[PDB]
Design a protein around this nucleic acid. Sequence first.
RNA 1: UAGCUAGUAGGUGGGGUAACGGCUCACCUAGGCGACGAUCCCUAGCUGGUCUGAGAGGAUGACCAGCCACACUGGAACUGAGACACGGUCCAGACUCCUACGGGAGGCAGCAGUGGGGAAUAUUGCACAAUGGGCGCAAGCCUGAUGCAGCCAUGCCGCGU
RNA 2: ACCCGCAGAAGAAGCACCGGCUAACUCCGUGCCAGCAGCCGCGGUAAUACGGAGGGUGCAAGCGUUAAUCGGAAUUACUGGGCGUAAAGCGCACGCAGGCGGUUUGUUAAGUCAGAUGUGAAAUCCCCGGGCUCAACCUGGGAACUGCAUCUGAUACUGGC
Lengths: 71, 129, 80, 205, 123, 82, 150
Amino acid sequence: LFGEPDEGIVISRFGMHADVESADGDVHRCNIRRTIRSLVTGDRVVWRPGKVKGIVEAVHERTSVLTRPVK
Amino acid sequence: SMQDPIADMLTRIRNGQAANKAAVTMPSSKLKVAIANVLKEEGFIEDFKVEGDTKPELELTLKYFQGKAVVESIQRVSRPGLRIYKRKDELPKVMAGLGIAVVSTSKGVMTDRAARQAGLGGEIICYVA
Amino acid sequence: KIRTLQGRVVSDKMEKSIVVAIERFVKHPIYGKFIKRTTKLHVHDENNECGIGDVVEIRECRPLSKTKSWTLVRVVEKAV
Amino acid sequence: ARYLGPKLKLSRREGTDLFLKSGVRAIDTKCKIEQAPGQHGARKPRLSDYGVQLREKQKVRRIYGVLERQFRNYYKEAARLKGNTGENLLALLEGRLDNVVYRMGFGATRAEARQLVSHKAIMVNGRVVNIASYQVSPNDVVSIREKAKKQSRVKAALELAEQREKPTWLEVDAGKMEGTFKRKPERSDLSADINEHLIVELYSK
Amino acid sequence: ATVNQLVRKPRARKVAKSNVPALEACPQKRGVCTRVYTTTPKKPNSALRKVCRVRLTNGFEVTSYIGGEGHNLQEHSVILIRGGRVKDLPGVRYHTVRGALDCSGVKDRKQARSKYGVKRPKA
Amino acid sequence: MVTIRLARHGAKKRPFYQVVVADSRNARNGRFIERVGFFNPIASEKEEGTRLDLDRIAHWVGQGATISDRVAALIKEVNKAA
Amino acid sequence: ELQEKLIAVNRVSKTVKGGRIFSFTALTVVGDGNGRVGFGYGKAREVPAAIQKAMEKARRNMINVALNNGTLQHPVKGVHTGSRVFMQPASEGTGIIAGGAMRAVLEVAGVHNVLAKAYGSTNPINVVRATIDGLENMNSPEMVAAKRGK
RNA sequence: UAGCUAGUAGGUGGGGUAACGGCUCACCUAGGCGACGAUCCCUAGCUGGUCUGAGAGGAUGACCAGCCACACUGGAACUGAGACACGGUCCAGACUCCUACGGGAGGCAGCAGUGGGGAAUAUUGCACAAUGGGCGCAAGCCUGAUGCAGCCAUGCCGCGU
RNA sequence: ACCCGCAGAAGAAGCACCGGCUAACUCCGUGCCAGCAGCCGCGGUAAUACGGAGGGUGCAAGCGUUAAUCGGAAUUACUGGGCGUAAAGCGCACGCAGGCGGUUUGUUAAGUCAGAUGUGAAAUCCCCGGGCUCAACCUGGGAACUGCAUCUGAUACUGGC
């Protein structure tokens, strides 16, 4: 999966997915690609739809200010 | 046994020959002797000699086939749940292609070889190679 | 071929309608041992001349009644 | 079918006689044999006995050039038999007209052999051919039938016929436009790859 | 095991090749994709595989794979379900085949045509 | 109502008709009473021939059963009966 | 025969001082007769080294095979553990689908008139070993009333 | 599905079919019935034989022969022995049509063909030439029975290629 | 049906596999992707396998797929499978059913042991001939008659007695 790169902030961790609220504000339950891993809710992401399901293939988790084990 | 005498017979043999009890003795029932006879006359035992049928003794002498145990095969198959002897030699054979497995005919218990082979049926009463 | 069979009636107070056992074996065969396959026909009884352990021969017949289609014929013996 | 196929190259992969690039240069030469005909796909033989045996029988199938459809047919007939299934099959196989179109020396290649029969252009004393799928008789004067009569193929063939798969059994002739299949092919004269407990063994569930 | 016991309740020869239930029949079905969905495979095969739920008319709304590289249109594309599940996919039951008619054709494949690649014209 | 008719048998063109008793009732074949010969009209070695077994036929007929003209074939076949 | 087939060398693992090592140990069959097939269990560290140690071993004890028609005297059955095995006297002239566990040992015996089949297990370790145990047993006869007159 | 019976059975008698027989009523008797598995439910039409499997067995039931069951909704008799007849009997009806609209009227589990269903599988076919069966006094006629041929790798064997 | 002419094969290979196993594998895109991928798994792997290219295998007018069966599976064991612990002693009894009990002759002859004969239809199956263009396609002949069905001898066996 691929789609169209778009920005979003990860509104929610959808368990299995992550649900991304887009730059627009549009929430898309998205997949999260095997390729990306630095994702968290709050990340600004490049998520893409499919060609909802999205896919996430870029993230943006900014610097540490809190963790658990350390993440 | 407690409920199949031929199968004790057979087993006693089994355990007998096993422990190369080249003689195994147990009561006759008329079949028992009769069978024993055939074995007797079929090298398996060379003889039996008997005393009693409502009282005990029927002593079979198992040879050595050839230094090795006479029988080197023997076991029950005629439990009160089982017979497969149909008339007109609608009883054929299993491992009695090597030994006997004395049948009981019109009258009697015989070497099976005789009634069996002979189409005379014979009831295939017990089992040896 | 024969169906006058020396069965046996045994049924009684079975008012005029007793049954004759034209009995049989059936082997449970593939997976062994001998069971009965069994036939009773309310035979000629007809006021119960098919009786108690009256090992009754019956001769196959017309329905003379609801089951009297094995007429009896004999009684041969009594059995326990 | 012939089954359709290209001849010298072939001779390189199966590596044995099967009677098929008949002309004036055949196998290898001017382009050897056994130095490929591939250059990618044969690059790691993933054999098994299935392989070995496959090839083993495959040869034999090819030796007669028969379609498998038919080959099968032979196998079975033999198999019914009280005998050791194998042998009796070979007689049968061999027994057909195509087999017998090359062994008299009309045909040479199955394709050619057949080509003749096939095109109503080799005969037998055997259930109207037009087909070498036909199967020749003891006394079958497998005889030439038109547009091949001691023509190129046949004339030359009658030579190598003699030396074909020694038909002691079918009297290899084709010069007299005849070829009197005297009797059936037997393992008096072999031309086999398998063994009768390699192929017999091979067939198995 | 006394015969007498056995006889009472007998013991079953047939086969015994079982794993889990599978369904329907009719050599094909008349069906079109519910929707054409997309799922993961397994992790080290680290891919994504393209699929479709599919209403039929010879039983069961199946989810179906749409294979090789690529898949059919969304929704109910005209899709051909020519059966399937995967070794590497538990419990799918009829699949939506391309390189085979109704569907789209298995794209970016031409390394098979009775199956995959093209649904070249059944001569 | 007994009939002895020729059931057209053998794969067509070559019928390998086979004279048979059946209830004349079936338009063509259907119910079978018992077989009674053949008439194969094409190219065969034996165990495969053409049979007319005139004798049995006659028993049936006696008590009323009927016969074909391709049984008349069979009948008058060498003028076997004719 | 005089044939030997090397049934198999076998990669086993010890699981040593350091790593997890793997060997060749060989069961091979040898036979130099219908009446003689011997199979040996070799040890060693190579396919040959193993085979050899098998062959050697195998050659150690070269023993009975399909007496009577190149076929058994009598059909024989084999267990070794839980192994269900079977072999018949027949002919090879009646055919013989010459299995592995029934034209390996049979082949190094030379004979093939004996048709067989094993139920249950895929383990040659026990099963062809059981096949062997299943083949052996076909006795010494002693008349046209052998057992019937010792 | 572990429960049965009053038409119940039997007896008994009428009654009935051709007729057997509760078989049935009349009466009575109490009979009269199932855990060797009944009762109950479904499902399956069912066989020669199909399928497969070494077979065991298992499977199978074809794409036949043999037999049936069954052939517009429910009901309902016939001729005829037989048929309450896939295109022989009455209504409702269902059902749909007829219909001056009431009344009525109207129907390929024969076929193609039609609808169309479903994965999808058959010509509005040819043919009596023979084949059969019928009718027809019969002659003949009839015969989508039938022959031949139509339509589909679906299923077989080949040459070819 | 059959029969045969012509030229040239004209008009006749695709299809499936090929990462093993399994008949067949590379080269490249991809490539931890997109994917393949029966089964194991192949997917960074510069592919083998993906994806393609190419090459190889394996087939014939076919060659693959689906739906889809008994088989192997001894995997439910009849043949032929399983309770010390791998899915196998009731908590434990009793215990009716069930089943099963010694022993001896005698005896039924029923079962059995001996027989009879009929009866399996047909297909003509198989077997084994046979028939046609091989073959497919047609038939026959021994073989489906078993068991039913029934008789009976022997009677030890077995049960009857």
